[PDB]
Amino acid sequence: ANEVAVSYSKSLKAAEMDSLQLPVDADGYITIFDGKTFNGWRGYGKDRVPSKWTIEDGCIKFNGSGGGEAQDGDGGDLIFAHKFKNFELEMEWKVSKGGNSGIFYLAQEVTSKDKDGNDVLEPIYISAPEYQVLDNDNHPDAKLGKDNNRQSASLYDMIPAVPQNAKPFGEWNKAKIMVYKGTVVHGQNDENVLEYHLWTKQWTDLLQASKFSQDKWPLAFELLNNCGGENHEGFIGMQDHGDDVWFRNIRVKVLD
């Protein structure tokens, strides 16, 4: 009753052939970060946690060197290597001034083939919807997109958080991501800030008005349009966008 087995994979596209015994509370939230280890976590596309991700004061910290999407040094996005389907995630996040990160969900590890048959690891964000994490006051992306749909807790580049009730940089915010049989809800600071439905005509329309449109990014469109792949499942994770960011109290309830 106090712990549950949680399967996890150890490397790119591998089976979940190991399990962790993780604490669960009376309401079914599984604590997936223990404050001390990266057990069950690995870099997206990797068999290890990049050293730029550290543990400090009971938090997961990304130690950013400032290159945005570049993911220079020993970086890359971080996943908890258990595919979830119907789930409610809660975590606290805090961004540095002018900082950018994100919470990914239903992510798939995706490769493509180059002209010579070599693999190319594709970005997590071309399969995974992103709950934006941002300093809404200082990061210029805050003013891009449309109707503030690149500010914190937005579905990045598609649906704005309303209300935009973020606390300013260097202050803790609470995130909720709920996916239940295609219904998706983002929460910020104990309010619901958007709601949408995967795999619908509305979902296709959102994609087509975004940077992941069929015309702008065909592979992104195809992955996202059938988000979670054949079995409508995938990873939670957090973004290396080159900036200091902290995450804590990371818990997930299986709704399935």
Add this chain to the structure above:
Amino acid sequence: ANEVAVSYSKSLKAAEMDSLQLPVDADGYITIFDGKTFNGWRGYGKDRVPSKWTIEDGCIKFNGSGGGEAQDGDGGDLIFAHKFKNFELEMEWKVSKGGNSGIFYLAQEVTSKDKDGNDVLEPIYISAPEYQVLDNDNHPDAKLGKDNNRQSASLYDMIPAVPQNAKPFGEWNKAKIMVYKGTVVHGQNDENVLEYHLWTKQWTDLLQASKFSQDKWPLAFELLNNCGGENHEGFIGMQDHGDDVWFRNIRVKVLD
């Protein structure tokens, strides 16, 4: 809080060992061209302003002889000799009928060695992304390239400005170049006309499709693929492409 110290270099590859006190407005834009002097400005590769650059009715003016890329006489590209990293440049430009120039950013002063060990000054454009400045209606380069990627406000011969909202020749156009932690946005006439991300696989892909591909121009590939060199910073400047062009209201906000 009316003025800020801005360091600048006096000659090829030198340290920024001197500073100007330059006005800053309440939004944090530094006025880097004072309407009267070339303080802090020098030719690319030079320790002086080339005499073909003049100050005319509160503008920086290039006085073109009509020889395109030749840079004949006392010409050459012009830089403001302060390396910027995370910044937003705004400036206004106007061209002569059929005129062509460009706004460079993140530029490095690069030399190579010839077969005998002498120096060769390499063009600014093998290190510096170029925001195209053009008479889109009369200069034939507007019809060259792919999908209008050589028209004004494009990332020259790589990403077209969309929309193409230039004002015609003899009229002032407003340019915006923002570089923030690798995110690049070009604006033209108060619209954002393209976005990209430096130092990503998408950036590499753009280069490999261009005249600066690894196959076609290895040195340019090396420089642009790691644009800004090891500290990801470099100069703003403007192009000698042999044609009369005017620039004014040149202002830069340091973002980080």
